[PDB]
Design a protein around this ligand. Structure first.
Ligand code: MG
Ligand code: MG
Ligand code: MG
Ligand code: MG
Ligand code: MG
Ligand code: MG
Length: 190
RNA sequence: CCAAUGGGGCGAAGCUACCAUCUGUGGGAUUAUGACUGAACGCCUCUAAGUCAGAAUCCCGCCCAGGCGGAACGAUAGCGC
């Protein structure tokens, strides 16, 4: 079955300016700008109102798979609003039974060195995605804080570190060592 | 000198032996898999749209040949313009 119309709307905070170049969404906020291209989805984007702006997503004559893309766009656009206003802050804890995991931040938070992971002599060097900054946590021991405006870049950056410290040829239910994503917050709490 | 290389010792050059010696190499997309964001299904979800890492595999490189396939350049005798 094709549905005549399926739509959803997004509310834009006053401090965020959204402009459309076709299906390219440009969100400008206090923390910067994010541009995402949605040309791989056949939807219709509309900006409504002037005082309280809104973004509308329309899908005319959509089957089940095409209808599922309508909310996906809204959620991405909301994350972009969240990124440019509050930012994204993933925290990671390093877990170890015997060998402390030493983390050194280089290149202004764009490179992470991991040493002595399960006692390995090999040094792991993880490169953060552009626009993502890693830093050791002054508040807690054995913790990292990744910050950025793009949720996917920040969360991909953290996945790289988490998968860098993988245990091999052991029972990973026993050998639990590794750095893991422990919290998903925002840079500015508001 | 002859004995169809008379026999035997040592033996140049050449050839030749893991029986001596030397040299044997880099990327790309990715598989399995593990994940990101994320609906579908207000939650969840590696998947649906989008995204990441990924290998004796695969393709290429390096290497071997070099097409009824080209190229630049030289010189061109009764011959070119
Ligand atoms: Mg064992
Ligand atoms: Mg005789
Ligand atoms: Mg001899
Ligand atoms: Mg590769
Ligand atoms: Mg996959
Ligand atoms: Mg890849």
């Amino acid at each position: 079955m094709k549905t005549i119309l399926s739509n959803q709307t997004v509310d834009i905070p006053e401090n965020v300016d959204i402009s459309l170049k076709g299906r390219t969404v440009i969100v400008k906020g206090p923390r910067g700008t994010l541009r995402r291209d949605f040309n791989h989805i056949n939807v219709e984007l509309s900006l409504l109102g002037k005082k309280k702006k809104r973004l509308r997503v329309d899908k005319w004559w959509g089957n089940r798979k095409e209808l599922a893309t309508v909310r996906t766009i809204c959620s991405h656009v909301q994350n972009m609003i969240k990124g440019v206003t509050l930012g994204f802050r993933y925290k990671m804890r390093s877990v170890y039974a015997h060998f402390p995991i030493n983390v050194v931040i280089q290149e202004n938070g764009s490179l992470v060195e991991i040493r002595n992971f399960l006692g390995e002599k090999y040094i792991r060097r993880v490169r953060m995605r552009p626009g993502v900054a890693c830093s050791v946590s002054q508040a807690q021991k054995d913790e990292l804080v990744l910050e950025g405006n793009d949720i996917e870049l920040v969360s991909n950056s953290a996945a790289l570190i988490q998968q860098a410290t993988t245990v091999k040829n052991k029972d990973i239910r026993k050998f639990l060592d590794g750095i893991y994503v422990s919290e998903k917050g925002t840079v500015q709490q508001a």
